[PDB]
Design brief:
2 copies of one chain form a homodimer. With about 180 residues, chain A is of the alpha+beta class. The first copy, chain A, has one domain: 3-Layer(aba) Sandwich (NADH Oxidase), CATH 3.40.109.10. The first copy, chain A, is built from 6 helices and 5 strands. A 4-stranded antiparallel β-sheet of chain A has the order 1-2-4-3, sandwiched between helices. Chain A is globular and about 50 Å long. Chains A and B meet through helix 1, helix 2, strand 1, helix 5 and strand 5 of A and helix 1, helix 2, strand 1 and helix 6 of B.
Chain lengths: ~180, ~180
């Protein structure tokens, strides 16, 4: 075990078996740092620093997935949001500040095409890491992409420029050589 | 010493001081498998599995950077690639197979505007993890987004549907608790 950083990656996958667990031996503000230290340590191309995040829990967590599971009207296509608001302790949701990405498109009008793409790179860079780290604490977590649904459902104290990217619900190659 | 996954995230930064180093105690194929299992264990959304990569070295490394540092005409814009060919051991270049995403767009024409984003997310996940893990071995690495240029410089053994995303040259959050 050295840069056994791989073993933490290999032991990680989508977990739907979820109970609103603390979990054992680890509080909430513990989790708060874990994602915080990733947003702070994740390289955004050209120091744009566009990706942010919001963690939601309790009746504020249940409040959103209950809103999605009403915009979903077919029962068998709502056993995902309602199993997210009745089985999960909370959910980490990630954003990308479209603000800077609009500024870089301004000052560098010639490269105003890689900027939206360089932001999509870094936001998925904090997603996989927070996810792979939450599962190290003991939690179980899964992906969700109800972006537009939670975006409208999102409260008012949110910057409207924060584009919704993901919802982390917690609870070979060729080588040359010719 | 527990889920000290964070320590590797913190102990990671762009390195330009590069010598074509093995490095000590670590062969090349040592590096090869590190990324090989990051591409393999990365959650491509909807199991599209579009993440591709190529490790480049030797006079095939200097060959491509010599091509980029020749389309750059102004000296001060050649200081990057010519230092990437004459100071580096090699480069990991990452792709996203446009194949599956095109298939997903076809089958689900309604969601055909989330697939390119779900591909940009997953590539911006194998990049950061490889970079974070290559520096665990002792190497020095950095981001390089000289796309199209290196893409054109690529030989013919590559699929023309592989989209060059990056070149890995090796050598606050609101709590919403009401």
């Amino acid at each position: 075990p050295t840069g056994n950083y791989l073993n933490a990656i290999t032991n990680r996958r989508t977990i739907y078996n979820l109970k609103p667990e603390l979990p054992q031996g680890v509080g909430l503000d513990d989790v708060k740092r874990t994602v915080h230290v990733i947003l702070k340590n994740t390289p955004t191309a050209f120091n744009s620093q566009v990706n942010r995040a919001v963690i939601i829990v309790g009746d504020t967590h249940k409040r959103i997935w209950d809103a999605v599971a009403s915009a979903m009207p077919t029962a068998e296509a709502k056993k995902r949001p309602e199993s997210c608001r009745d089985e999960a302790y909370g959910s980490v949701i990630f954003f990308t500040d479209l603000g800077p990405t609009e500024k870089l498109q301004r000052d560098f009008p010639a490269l105003a095409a890689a900027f939206p793409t360089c932001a999509a790179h870094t936001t998925g860079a904090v997603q996989i890491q927070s996810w792979t780290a939450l599962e190290l604490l003991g939690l179980g977590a899964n992906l969700q992409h109800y972006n537009d649904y939670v975006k409208s459902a999102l409260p008012q104290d949110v910057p409207i420029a924060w584009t919704v990217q993901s919802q982390l619900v917690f609870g070979n190659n060729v080588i040359n050589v010719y």
